[PDB]
CSV table of C-alpha atoms and ligand atoms in Angstrom, one decimal:
chain,number,residue,atom,x,y,z
A,242,UNK,CA,10.6,-7.8,-22.4
A,243,UNK,CA,7.5,-5.8,-22.8
A,244,UNK,CA,4.8,-6.5,-25.5
A,245,UNK,CA,6.4,-5.4,-28.8
A,246,UNK,CA,8.5,-2.5,-30.2
A,247,UNK,CA,9.8,-1.0,-26.9
A,248,UNK,CA,12.9,0.9,-25.8
A,249,UNK,CA,13.1,0.0,-22.1
A,250,UNK,CA,12.8,3.4,-20.4
A,251,UNK,CA,12.2,3.5,-16.6
A,252,UNK,CA,9.6,6.0,-15.4
A,253,UNK,CA,10.6,8.6,-12.7
A,254,UNK,CA,8.0,9.1,-9.9
A,255,UNK,CA,8.8,12.2,-7.9
A,256,UNK,CA,7.5,13.5,-4.5
A,257,UNK,CA,7.6,16.8,-2.7
A,258,UNK,CA,6.2,18.2,0.5
A,259,UNK,CA,3.5,20.6,-0.6
A,260,UNK,CA,1.5,23.4,1.2
A,261,UNK,CA,-0.7,20.8,2.8
A,262,UNK,CA,-4.2,21.2,4.1
A,263,UNK,CA,-5.6,21.0,7.7
A,264,UNK,CA,-5.0,17.9,9.8
A,265,UNK,CA,-7.8,15.4,9.9
A,266,UNK,CA,-11.0,15.3,11.9
A,267,UNK,CA,-12.2,12.4,14.0
A,268,UNK,CA,-12.7,9.7,11.4
A,269,UNK,CA,-10.0,7.3,10.1
A,270,UNK,CA,-11.7,7.5,6.7
A,271,UNK,CA,-11.4,11.3,7.0
A,272,UNK,CA,-7.7,11.3,6.3
A,273,UNK,CA,-7.0,12.1,2.7
A,274,UNK,CA,-4.0,11.0,0.7
A,275,UNK,CA,-2.5,14.2,-0.6
A,276,UNK,CA,-0.6,12.4,-3.5
A,277,UNK,CA,-1.3,9.2,-5.4
A,278,UNK,CA,0.9,7.2,-7.8
A,279,UNK,CA,0.6,3.7,-9.2
A,280,UNK,CA,2.7,1.0,-11.0
A,281,UNK,CA,1.5,-0.5,-14.2
A,282,UNK,CA,4.2,-2.4,-16.1
A,283,UNK,CA,7.9,-2.3,-16.8
A,284,UNK,CA,10.5,-0.5,-14.6
A,285,UNK,CA,10.3,2.3,-12.1
A,286,UNK,CA,12.3,4.2,-9.6
A,287,UNK,CA,11.2,6.4,-6.6
A,288,UNK,CA,12.9,9.7,-6.0
A,289,UNK,CA,12.4,10.1,-2.3
A,290,UNK,CA,13.8,13.5,-1.2
A,291,UNK,CA,12.3,12.9,2.3
A,292,UNK,CA,15.4,12.3,4.2
A,293,UNK,CA,15.8,16.0,4.8
A,294,UNK,CA,15.3,16.5,8.6
A,295,UNK,CA,12.6,13.8,8.8
A,296,UNK,CA,13.4,11.3,11.5
A,297,UNK,CA,12.4,7.7,11.2
A,298,UNK,CA,10.1,6.5,14.0
A,299,UNK,CA,10.9,3.0,15.2
A,300,UNK,CA,7.8,0.7,15.6
A,301,UNK,CA,6.5,-0.2,19.0
A,302,UNK,CA,3.2,-1.1,20.8
A,303,UNK,CA,1.0,1.7,19.4
A,304,UNK,CA,2.7,4.4,17.4
A,305,UNK,CA,5.3,4.3,14.6
A,306,UNK,CA,5.4,2.3,11.4
A,307,UNK,CA,3.8,-1.1,10.8
A,308,UNK,CA,6.5,-2.5,8.4
A,309,UNK,CA,5.7,-6.2,9.2
A,310,UNK,CA,4.5,-7.8,6.0
A,311,UNK,CA,7.0,-5.6,4.0
A,312,UNK,CA,10.5,-6.2,5.2
A,313,UNK,CA,12.2,-3.4,3.1
A,314,UNK,CA,12.6,0.1,4.5
A,315,UNK,CA,11.5,3.0,2.4
A,316,UNK,CA,15.0,4.1,1.3
A,317,UNK,CA,15.8,0.7,-0.1
A,318,UNK,CA,13.0,0.4,-2.7
A,319,UNK,CA,15.3,1.5,-5.5
A,320,UNK,CA,17.4,-1.7,-5.4
A,321,UNK,CA,16.3,-4.7,-7.4
A,322,UNK,CA,12.9,-5.9,-6.1
A,323,UNK,CA,10.0,-7.7,-7.7
A,324,UNK,CA,6.4,-6.7,-7.1
A,325,UNK,CA,3.1,-7.6,-8.7
A,326,UNK,CA,1.2,-4.3,-8.1
A,327,UNK,CA,2.5,-1.2,-6.4
A,328,UNK,CA,1.0,2.2,-5.3
A,329,UNK,CA,2.4,4.6,-2.8
A,330,UNK,CA,0.9,7.8,-1.5
A,331,UNK,CA,1.6,10.3,1.3
A,332,UNK,CA,-1.0,11.4,3.9
A,333,UNK,CA,-0.7,13.8,6.9
A,334,UNK,CA,-2.5,12.0,9.7
A,335,UNK,CA,-2.0,11.5,13.4
A,336,UNK,CA,1.0,9.6,14.8
A,337,UNK,CA,-0.1,7.3,17.7
A,338,UNK,CA,-2.7,5.4,15.7
A,339,UNK,CA,-2.0,6.1,12.1
A,340,UNK,CA,-0.6,2.8,11.0
A,341,UNK,CA,-2.0,0.4,13.6
A,342,UNK,CA,-5.5,1.5,12.6
A,343,UNK,CA,-4.9,2.3,9.0
A,344,UNK,CA,-3.6,-1.1,8.1
A,345,UNK,CA,-6.4,-3.3,9.6
A,346,UNK,CA,-9.5,-1.2,8.9
A,347,UNK,CA,-7.7,0.8,6.2
A,348,UNK,CA,-6.5,0.8,2.6
A,349,UNK,CA,-2.9,-0.3,2.6
A,350,UNK,CA,-0.8,-3.5,3.2
A,351,UNK,CA,1.7,-1.6,5.3
A,352,UNK,CA,2.6,2.0,6.1
A,353,UNK,CA,5.5,4.0,7.4
A,354,UNK,CA,5.6,6.9,9.8
A,355,UNK,CA,8.0,9.7,9.4
A,356,UNK,CA,7.9,12.7,11.7
A,357,UNK,CA,9.1,16.3,12.0
A,358,UNK,CA,8.5,19.4,14.1
A,359,UNK,CA,4.7,19.6,13.9
A,360,UNK,CA,2.1,21.5,15.8
A,361,UNK,CA,0.3,19.4,18.5
A,362,UNK,CA,-3.3,20.1,17.4
A,363,UNK,CA,-4.2,16.8,15.7
A,364,UNK,CA,-7.3,14.8,16.3
A,365,UNK,CA,-6.3,11.1,16.6
A,366,UNK,CA,-8.1,8.1,15.3
A,367,UNK,CA,-9.0,5.1,17.5
A,368,UNK,CA,-12.2,3.6,18.9
A,369,UNK,CA,-13.0,5.5,22.1
A,370,UNK,CA,-9.9,7.7,22.2
A,371,UNK,CA,-10.7,10.2,19.5
A,372,UNK,CA,-11.0,13.3,21.8
A,373,UNK,CA,-7.3,14.3,22.4
A,374,UNK,CA,-4.6,16.3,20.5
A,375,UNK,CA,-1.6,14.6,19.1
A,376,UNK,CA,1.4,15.1,16.7
A,377,UNK,CA,1.2,15.2,12.9
A,378,UNK,CA,4.0,13.5,11.1
A,379,UNK,CA,3.6,12.5,7.5
A,380,UNK,CA,2.8,8.8,7.0
A,381,UNK,CA,3.4,7.2,3.6
A,382,UNK,CA,1.4,4.3,2.4
A,383,UNK,CA,2.6,1.4,0.3
A,384,UNK,CA,0.3,-1.4,-1.1
A,385,UNK,CA,2.6,-4.3,-1.8
B,98,UNK,CA,-8.3,-6.8,-40.1
B,99,UNK,CA,-11.5,-6.3,-41.9
B,100,UNK,CA,-11.8,-2.5,-42.0
B,101,UNK,CA,-12.3,-1.7,-38.3
B,102,UNK,CA,-9.3,-1.3,-36.1
B,103,UNK,CA,-5.9,0.1,-37.0
B,104,UNK,CA,-3.9,-3.2,-36.8
B,105,UNK,CA,-3.8,-4.4,-40.5
B,106,UNK,CA,-3.1,-8.1,-40.2
B,107,UNK,CA,-5.1,-11.1,-41.4
B,108,UNK,CA,-3.0,-14.2,-40.4
B,109,UNK,CA,-1.7,-15.8,-37.2
B,110,UNK,CA,1.6,-14.6,-35.6
B,111,UNK,CA,-0.3,-11.4,-34.7
B,112,UNK,CA,-1.0,-9.8,-31.4
B,113,UNK,CA,-3.9,-9.2,-29.0
B,114,UNK,CA,-5.4,-6.2,-27.2
B,115,UNK,CA,-5.9,-6.4,-23.5
B,116,UNK,CA,-7.1,-2.9,-22.8
B,117,UNK,CA,-9.0,-1.2,-20.0
B,118,UNK,CA,-11.7,1.4,-20.8
B,119,UNK,CA,-13.4,4.1,-18.8
B,120,UNK,CA,-16.6,5.9,-19.7
B,121,UNK,CA,-15.3,7.8,-22.6
B,122,UNK,CA,-11.6,7.1,-23.3
B,123,UNK,CA,-9.1,4.2,-23.6
B,124,UNK,CA,-5.8,3.6,-21.9
B,125,UNK,CA,-3.3,0.8,-21.2
B,126,UNK,CA,-2.8,-0.7,-24.6
B,127,UNK,CA,-0.5,-3.7,-24.3
B,128,UNK,CA,-0.2,-6.0,-27.2
B,129,UNK,CA,0.8,-9.5,-26.2
B,130,UNK,CA,1.6,-11.9,-29.1
B,131,UNK,CA,-0.4,-15.0,-30.0
B,132,UNK,CA,2.9,-16.7,-29.1
B,133,UNK,CA,3.0,-17.5,-25.3
B,134,UNK,CA,-0.9,-17.5,-25.4
B,135,UNK,CA,-1.7,-20.4,-27.7
B,136,UNK,CA,-5.3,-21.1,-27.0
B,137,UNK,CA,-8.0,-19.4,-24.9
B,138,UNK,CA,-8.4,-21.6,-21.8
B,139,UNK,CA,-9.9,-19.5,-19.1
B,140,UNK,CA,-10.6,-15.9,-18.1
B,141,UNK,CA,-11.1,-14.6,-14.5
B,142,UNK,CA,-12.0,-11.3,-12.8
B,143,UNK,CA,-11.0,-11.2,-9.1
B,144,UNK,CA,-12.4,-8.8,-6.4
B,145,UNK,CA,-9.5,-7.9,-4.2
B,146,UNK,CA,-6.8,-5.9,-5.9
B,147,UNK,CA,-9.3,-5.6,-8.8
B,148,UNK,CA,-7.1,-7.7,-11.1
B,149,UNK,CA,-8.1,-9.5,-14.3
B,150,UNK,CA,-6.6,-12.8,-15.5
B,151,UNK,CA,-6.6,-13.9,-19.1
B,152,UNK,CA,-5.7,-17.6,-18.4
B,153,UNK,CA,-3.0,-17.9,-15.8
B,154,UNK,CA,-1.0,-14.7,-15.2
B,155,UNK,CA,-1.8,-11.1,-14.8
B,156,UNK,CA,-2.7,-8.7,-17.5
B,157,UNK,CA,-4.1,-5.6,-15.7
B,158,UNK,CA,-4.3,-4.3,-12.1
B,159,UNK,CA,-5.4,-0.9,-10.8
B,160,UNK,CA,-6.0,0.8,-7.4
B,161,UNK,CA,-9.5,0.1,-6.4
B,162,UNK,CA,-11.3,-2.8,-4.6
B,163,UNK,CA,-14.4,-3.3,-6.7
B,164,UNK,CA,-16.7,-6.3,-7.1
B,165,UNK,CA,-17.7,-7.7,-10.5
B,166,UNK,CA,-21.0,-6.5,-11.9
B,167,UNK,CA,-21.3,-8.3,-15.2
B,168,UNK,CA,-19.5,-10.4,-17.8
B,169,UNK,CA,-20.1,-11.8,-21.3
B,170,UNK,CA,-18.5,-13.7,-24.2
B,171,UNK,CA,-19.1,-13.5,-27.9
B,172,UNK,CA,-18.2,-16.5,-30.1
B,173,UNK,CA,-19.8,-18.1,-33.2
B,174,UNK,CA,-19.3,-21.8,-32.4
B,175,UNK,CA,-17.0,-24.1,-30.5
B,176,UNK,CA,-17.2,-25.7,-27.0
B,177,UNK,CA,-20.0,-24.7,-24.7
B,178,UNK,CA,-18.5,-22.1,-22.4
B,179,UNK,CA,-18.9,-22.3,-18.6
B,180,UNK,CA,-19.7,-19.5,-16.1
B,181,UNK,CA,-18.9,-20.0,-12.4
B,182,UNK,CA,-18.4,-17.8,-9.4
B,183,UNK,CA,-16.3,-18.7,-6.4
B,184,UNK,CA,-15.0,-18.1,-2.9
B,185,UNK,CA,-11.4,-18.0,-1.5
B,186,UNK,CA,-9.8,-21.0,0.1
B,187,UNK,CA,-6.3,-22.4,0.6
B,188,UNK,CA,-4.9,-25.0,-1.8
B,189,UNK,CA,-1.7,-26.4,-3.0
B,190,UNK,CA,-0.6,-27.6,-6.5
B,191,UNK,CA,1.8,-30.3,-7.7
B,192,UNK,CA,3.5,-29.0,-10.8
B,193,UNK,CA,6.5,-30.3,-12.8
C,290,UNK,CA,-5.3,7.4,30.0
C,291,UNK,CA,-1.5,8.1,29.6
C,292,UNK,CA,-1.1,7.4,26.0
C,293,UNK,CA,-2.1,11.0,25.2
C,294,UNK,CA,1.1,12.5,23.7
C,295,UNK,CA,3.4,10.7,26.1
C,296,UNK,CA,6.1,8.9,24.2
C,297,UNK,CA,7.6,5.7,25.4
C,298,UNK,CA,11.4,5.8,26.1
C,299,UNK,CA,13.2,2.7,25.0
C,300,UNK,CA,15.6,1.3,27.6
C,301,UNK,CA,19.4,1.7,27.1
C,302,UNK,CA,22.6,2.0,29.1
C,303,UNK,CA,21.5,4.8,31.6
C,304,UNK,CA,18.1,6.3,31.0
C,305,UNK,CA,14.7,5.0,30.1
C,306,UNK,CA,12.8,2.2,31.7
C,307,UNK,CA,14.1,-0.9,33.5
C,308,UNK,CA,11.4,-3.4,32.5
C,309,UNK,CA,13.7,-6.5,32.9
C,310,UNK,CA,12.2,-8.6,35.7
C,311,UNK,CA,8.7,-7.6,34.4
C,312,UNK,CA,8.3,-8.6,30.7
C,313,UNK,CA,4.9,-7.0,30.2
C,314,UNK,CA,4.6,-3.4,28.9
C,315,UNK,CA,2.3,-0.9,30.8
C,316,UNK,CA,-0.5,-1.0,28.2
C,317,UNK,CA,-0.9,-4.8,28.5
C,318,UNK,CA,-1.6,-5.2,32.2
C,319,UNK,CA,-5.4,-5.4,31.5
C,320,UNK,CA,-5.0,-8.8,29.7
C,321,UNK,CA,-5.2,-12.0,31.8
C,322,UNK,CA,-2.2,-12.0,34.2
C,323,UNK,CA,-1.6,-13.5,37.6
C,324,UNK,CA,0.2,-11.6,40.4
C,325,UNK,CA,0.6,-12.1,44.1
C,326,UNK,CA,0.8,-8.5,45.3
C,327,UNK,CA,0.5,-5.4,43.2
C,328,UNK,CA,0.9,-1.7,43.8
C,329,UNK,CA,1.5,1.1,41.2
C,330,UNK,CA,2.2,4.7,41.7
C,331,UNK,CA,3.3,7.7,39.6
C,332,UNK,CA,6.2,10.0,40.4
C,333,UNK,CA,7.8,13.0,38.6
C,334,UNK,CA,11.5,12.5,38.9
C,335,UNK,CA,14.5,12.9,36.6
C,336,UNK,CA,15.0,10.9,33.5
C,337,UNK,CA,18.6,9.8,33.1
D,1,LIG,C1,5.6,19.7,5.3
D,1,LIG,O1,4.2,19.8,5.1
D,1,LIG,C2,3.5,20.1,6.3
D,1,LIG,C3,2.0,20.1,5.8
D,1,LIG,O2,1.7,21.3,5.2
D,1,LIG,C4,3.9,21.4,6.9
D,1,LIG,O3,3.2,21.6,8.1
D,1,LIG,C5,2.3,22.8,8.1
D,1,LIG,O4,2.9,24.0,8.7
D,1,LIG,C6,2.1,25.1,8.7
D,1,LIG,C7,2.9,26.3,9.3
D,1,LIG,O5,3.3,25.9,10.6
D,1,LIG,C8,0.8,24.9,9.5
D,1,LIG,O6,-0.1,26.0,9.3
D,1,LIG,C9,-0.7,26.4,10.6
D,1,LIG,O7,-1.6,25.4,11.1
D,1,LIG,C10,-2.2,25.8,12.4
D,1,LIG,C11,-3.1,24.6,12.8
D,1,LIG,O8,-2.3,23.6,13.4
D,1,LIG,C12,-3.0,27.1,12.2
D,1,LIG,O9,-3.5,27.5,13.5
D,1,LIG,C13,-2.0,28.2,11.7
D,1,LIG,O10,-2.8,29.4,11.5
D,1,LIG,C14,-1.4,27.7,10.4
D,1,LIG,N1,-0.5,28.8,9.9
D,1,LIG,C15,-0.7,29.6,8.8
D,1,LIG,C16,-2.0,29.3,8.1
D,1,LIG,O11,0.1,30.4,8.5
D,1,LIG,C17,0.1,23.6,8.9
D,1,LIG,O12,-1.0,23.3,9.7
D,1,LIG,C18,1.1,22.4,9.0
D,1,LIG,N2,0.4,21.2,8.5
D,1,LIG,C19,0.3,20.1,9.2
D,1,LIG,C20,0.9,20.1,10.5
D,1,LIG,O13,-0.2,19.1,8.7
D,1,LIG,C21,5.4,21.4,7.1
D,1,LIG,O14,5.8,22.7,7.6
D,1,LIG,C22,6.2,21.1,5.9
D,1,LIG,N3,7.6,21.0,6.1
D,1,LIG,C23,8.5,21.6,5.4
D,1,LIG,C24,8.0,22.4,4.2
D,1,LIG,O15,9.7,21.5,5.7
D,2,LIG,C1,-4.8,2.9,-27.4
D,2,LIG,O1,-5.0,2.7,-28.8
D,2,LIG,C2,-6.1,3.5,-29.4
D,2,LIG,C3,-6.2,3.2,-30.9
D,2,LIG,O2,-7.5,3.3,-31.3
D,2,LIG,C4,-5.7,5.0,-29.2
D,2,LIG,O3,-6.8,5.8,-29.7
D,2,LIG,C5,-6.4,7.0,-30.3
D,2,LIG,O4,-6.5,8.1,-29.4
D,2,LIG,C6,-6.1,9.4,-29.9
D,2,LIG,C7,-6.1,10.3,-28.7
D,2,LIG,O5,-7.3,10.2,-28.0
D,2,LIG,C8,-7.0,9.8,-31.0
D,2,LIG,O6,-6.6,11.0,-31.6
D,2,LIG,C9,-7.0,8.7,-32.1
D,2,LIG,O7,-7.9,9.0,-33.2
D,2,LIG,C10,-7.3,7.3,-31.5
D,2,LIG,N1,-7.2,6.3,-32.6
D,2,LIG,C11,-8.2,5.7,-33.2
D,2,LIG,C12,-9.6,6.2,-32.8
D,2,LIG,O8,-8.1,4.9,-34.1
D,2,LIG,C13,-5.5,5.3,-27.7
D,2,LIG,O9,-5.0,6.6,-27.4
D,2,LIG,C14,-4.4,4.3,-27.1
D,2,LIG,N2,-4.2,4.5,-25.7
D,2,LIG,C15,-3.1,5.1,-25.2
D,2,LIG,C16,-2.0,5.5,-26.1
D,2,LIG,O10,-3.0,5.2,-24.0
D,3,LIG,C1,13.8,10.0,-16.2
D,3,LIG,O1,13.2,9.1,-17.2
D,3,LIG,C2,13.9,9.1,-18.5
D,3,LIG,C3,13.2,8.2,-19.4
D,3,LIG,O2,11.7,8.4,-19.3
D,3,LIG,C4,15.4,8.7,-18.3
D,3,LIG,O3,16.0,8.8,-19.5
D,3,LIG,C5,16.0,9.6,-17.3
D,3,LIG,O4,17.4,9.2,-17.0
D,3,LIG,C6,15.3,9.6,-15.9
D,3,LIG,N1,15.9,10.5,-15.0
D,3,LIG,C7,16.6,10.1,-13.9
D,3,LIG,C8,16.8,8.7,-13.7
D,3,LIG,O5,17.1,11.0,-13.2
D,4,LIG,C1,14.9,14.0,-7.1
D,4,LIG,O1,14.3,15.3,-7.5
D,4,LIG,C2,15.1,16.5,-7.2
D,4,LIG,C3,14.3,17.6,-7.6
D,4,LIG,O2,13.0,17.7,-6.9
D,4,LIG,C4,16.4,16.4,-7.9
D,4,LIG,O3,17.2,17.5,-7.6
D,4,LIG,C5,17.2,15.1,-7.5
D,4,LIG,O4,18.4,15.0,-8.3
D,4,LIG,C6,16.3,13.9,-7.7
D,4,LIG,N1,17.0,12.7,-7.3
D,4,LIG,C7,17.3,11.6,-8.0
D,4,LIG,C8,16.9,11.7,-9.5
D,4,LIG,O5,17.9,10.6,-7.6
D,5,LIG,C1,-9.1,-10.8,-0.6
D,5,LIG,O1,-10.4,-10.0,-0.3
D,5,LIG,C2,-10.8,-10.1,1.0
D,5,LIG,C3,-12.2,-9.3,1.0
D,5,LIG,O2,-12.6,-9.2,2.4
D,5,LIG,C4,-9.8,-9.4,1.9
D,5,LIG,O3,-10.2,-9.5,3.3
D,5,LIG,C5,-8.5,-10.1,1.8
D,5,LIG,O4,-7.5,-9.4,2.5
D,5,LIG,C6,-8.0,-10.2,0.3
D,5,LIG,N1,-6.8,-10.9,0.2
D,5,LIG,C7,-5.6,-10.4,-0.2
D,5,LIG,C8,-5.6,-8.9,-0.5
D,5,LIG,O5,-4.6,-11.1,-0.3
D,6,LIG,C1,-6.3,5.1,-6.7
D,6,LIG,O1,-5.3,5.5,-7.7
D,6,LIG,C2,-5.8,6.3,-8.8
D,6,LIG,C3,-4.7,6.6,-9.8
D,6,LIG,O2,-4.7,7.9,-10.2
D,6,LIG,C4,-6.4,7.6,-8.2
D,6,LIG,O3,-7.0,8.4,-9.3
D,6,LIG,C5,-7.5,7.3,-7.1
D,6,LIG,O4,-7.9,8.5,-6.5
D,6,LIG,C6,-6.9,6.4,-6.1
D,6,LIG,N1,-7.9,6.0,-5.1
D,6,LIG,C7,-7.9,6.5,-3.8
D,6,LIG,C8,-6.9,7.4,-3.4
D,6,LIG,O5,-8.8,6.1,-3.1
């Protein structure tokens, strides 16, 4: 039950790949979330149309996702869960050090790392290794 | 009700207004009843996750991570109220 | 300096690494280990 005088209507949060901007410069604060949404009260669902030709990158020593501390995978949010505060956002950063740097010194509890066929001119973020060129797969954030 | 806000009720069994407010406008009106919140016991404002706590549970979260800058309570009479700041530790609670 | 755009290939039935009998991964040699004799070398062969 909500406060008073409510018809329980779930909100529909949508996403779409847009004509994005340039990949990021050298700073890990210099990656910009090119979407933002938030959860306030009641019910929600998340229309993810990002299974279309986007492979999932399995986590390992440096690159990939950092789904520890959030056991669910991104295509299983829509089942019955219980959160306390929720906000997801997409961001087009580098791939080898996106999540392993953007969880500790960053702004999310855990993040995922999808990939696609991207141009290999992407300035990665890490202490001392920020002078190379990497891939650019889209990485979603989730603040559980 | 006296004249001021559009609620029009002068009794108990009415509701409350936990509402956030930016510089010019208002949003997030939720109206919890005086039922389930019988008596004002405590009121916190926590740094991380920027969440605010009328006694016990949540009433409002948002995106940012912003520290408290001020607080204040109006009341005519009653018990002498207490202000206190705190740090973060681990604890465990027996509850039946 | 071979993390630059070089993916790691997870071991399976034919291709990939054969890291059994050496539990460490290549980017974790620099922590405190103890060997008895050690020699590494790179070589550009096939993959499968
Ligand atoms: C999902 O969104 C991605 C983010 O926009 C898209 O990736 C973009 O593709 C563009 C076309 O290949 C790239 O533009 C080129 O970028 C290079 C720099 O790497 C420039 O030199 C080129 O001039 C420029 N081409 C132009 C201006 O015509 C974007 O840089 C690139 N964005 C990235 C990698 O972050 C995906 O294509 C898109 N996928 C879809 C729609 O399926
Ligand atoms: C929360 O409640 C207040 C009630 O005061 C709403 O304020 C009204 O806002 C609209 C649009 O800005 C004005 O046209 C009305 O005149 C306001 N009512 C007043 C001043 O009594 C406010 O919009 C509500 N917040 C929501 C719905 O998000
Ligand atoms: C979108 O939300 C409305 C209520 O706001 C709901 O009626 C509708 O079914 C939703 N659309 C879906 C679930 O595709
Ligand atoms: C998600 O949105 C697309 C349009 O962008 C729509 O075609 C699709 O049905 C939606 N999926 C849902 C509601 O599950
Ligand atoms: C509480 O705030 C501190 C501030 O440094 C932060 O390090 C910690 O992760 C926060 N705890 C949470 C989010 O559970
Ligand atoms: C946090 O979420 C709000 C919700 O709209 C957004 O306006 C704000 O830019 C977000 N903060 C970021 C992305 O740092």
